């Protein structure tokens, strides 16, 4: 019979297990025999305390580098305010050592863990590319709890070198099966930020992860958008418990918070899943998340049922990760067919937006051709438009099966007159639907002001298979 860990703070790790069912069902994976042995995870952040008493036994120098100072040692820089504690807190969530009388345990407490020191300095395109592309035939899973500013007025994503690093990773990384990139969806809730305005979370090559509070609510910092895939627990109000992990200066903390704590927990659960089937591709892993995640008892006002009967929300994606279900379904999973891509240029002429614009188009989804798609994965609406105040726009897209995705909600702080320049808004909400038929795009002015602009390009890009 499985014996659960004896670490002193393990009883406070409410999100791992318990009899209440408000947990990620991690103990059920442990009891099936999966604890992370043989899997390598790298934390891309401000450094990792490699000599920490709850990390030293799992530390892997092959998964580590210091891009800020150009050396192999990722030790954080010590300061009076402990500014560089962030990466060490994230690492302990994944792979803190078990049964050693220190702090708590990681989700994958027998995995190997490294860190890339890259946030303690100016974060250029080259700095990002060198970190995402580190040792891609040794590191299996990359975790990133950082991104563009969450001020509610920024539109930004990976530049050329960083985008090239994503494509190289999913194509040639992990022996051709593809690197796994896990991303925190953002902390911009108080600013009414949208995570579709962040190109890292909006990318098809990352698994974007949101947060839920202990009592099952949408936290104050949460950002809603259609590109989010799933959810893990994190912090909420001061009556709700928080995350337990390793802290700087060889300490233990019980107050790790925010979107930053959600992505590491997802990375650990994905590490358990890879141990259960090391042949899973980067796309296999997203299929498993979609099928096994759990909406039950997460509170939101926008839960909707999509074309294949699955519940989906802009705050939570397909719901909470379920580690026991992930490892069980992985063991006999059949690899998906190669990915197809069908490009449909919608507009014949530019269209004035005015107060409201609706664009309807019936598509065949490349019928008769080698890239015919009957089983959708991701879909993008790539839009070029001008407008006088960007944050007054709201944008929706409806699939032929009737699923309505919010591509952009109103952003009160976004005063920009710069519009969108071929920006690829992405939705996960129509996964496994047939994309043949009528699609509808809606753009509307949500304010009483007399705003003006023009839509000049709309490309619908479909990804998926025909089996």
């Amino acid at each position: 019979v499985y014996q659960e860990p004896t670490d002193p703070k393990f009883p406070q790790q409410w999100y791992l297990s318990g009899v209440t069912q408000r947990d990620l069902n991690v103990k059920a994976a442990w009891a099936q025999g999966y604890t992370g042995h043989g899997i390598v995870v790298s934390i891309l952040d401000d450094g990792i305390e490699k000599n920490h008493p709850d990390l030293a036994g799992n530390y892997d120098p092959g998964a580590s580098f210091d891009v800020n100072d150009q050396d192999p040692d990722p030790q954080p820089r010590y300061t009076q305010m402990n500014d560089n504690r962030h990466g060490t807190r994230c690492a302990g969530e994944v792979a803190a050592v078990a049964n050693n009388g220190v702090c708590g345990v990681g989700v994958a407490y027998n995995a190997r863990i490294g860190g890339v020191r890259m946030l303690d300095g100016e974060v250029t395109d080259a700095v990002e590319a060198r970190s995402l592309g580190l040792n891609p035939n040794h590191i299996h899973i990359y975790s990133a709890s950082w991104g563009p500013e969450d001020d509610g007025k920024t539109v930004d994503g990976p530049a050329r070198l960083a985008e090239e690093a994503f494509f190289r990773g999913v194509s040639q990384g992990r022996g051709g099966l593809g690197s796994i990139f896990v991303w925190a969806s953002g902390n911009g809730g108080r600013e009414h930020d949208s995570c579709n305005c962040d190109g890292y979370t909006n990318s098809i090559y990352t698994l974007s992860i949101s947060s839920a509070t202990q009592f099952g609510n949408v936290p104050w910092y949460s950002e809603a958008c259609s590109s989010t895939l799933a959810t893990t627990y994190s912090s909420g109000n001061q009556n709700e418990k928080q995350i337990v992990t390793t802290d700087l200066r060889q300490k233990c903390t019980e107050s790790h918070t925010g979107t930053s704590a959600s992505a590491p927990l997802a990375a650990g659960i994905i590490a358990l899943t890879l141990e259960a089937n090391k042949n899973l591709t980067w796309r296999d892993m997203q299929h498993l998340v979609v099928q096994t995640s759990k909406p039950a008892h997460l509170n939101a006002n926008d839960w909707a049922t999509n074309g294949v009967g699955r519940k989906v929300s802009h705050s939570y994606g397909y719901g909470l990760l379920d580690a026991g279900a992930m490892v069980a379904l992985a063991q006999n999973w059949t690899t998906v067919a190669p990915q197809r891509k069908c490009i449909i240029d919608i507009l014949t002429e530019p269209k004035d937006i005015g107060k409201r614009l609706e664009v309807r188009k019936t598509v065949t989804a490349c019928l008769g051709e080698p890239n015919h798609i009957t089983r959708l994965e991701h879909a993008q609406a790539r839009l070029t438009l001008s407008y006088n105040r960007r944050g007054d726009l709201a944008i929706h897209l409806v699939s032929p099966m009737g699923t309505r995705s919010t591509l952009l909600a109103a952003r009160p702080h976004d005063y920009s007159a710069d519009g969108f320049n071929d920006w690829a808004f992405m939705t996960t909400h129509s996964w496994d639907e047939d994309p043949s038929g009528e699609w509808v795009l809606e753009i509307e002015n949500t304010s009483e002001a007399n705003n003006y602009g023009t839509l000049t390009k709309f490309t619908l890009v479909l990804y998926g298979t025909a089996s």
Partner: peptide, 6 residues
């Protein structure tokens, strides 16, 4: 105003 934030 950093390009990227924790």
């Amino acid at each position: 105003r950093r390009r990227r934030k924790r």
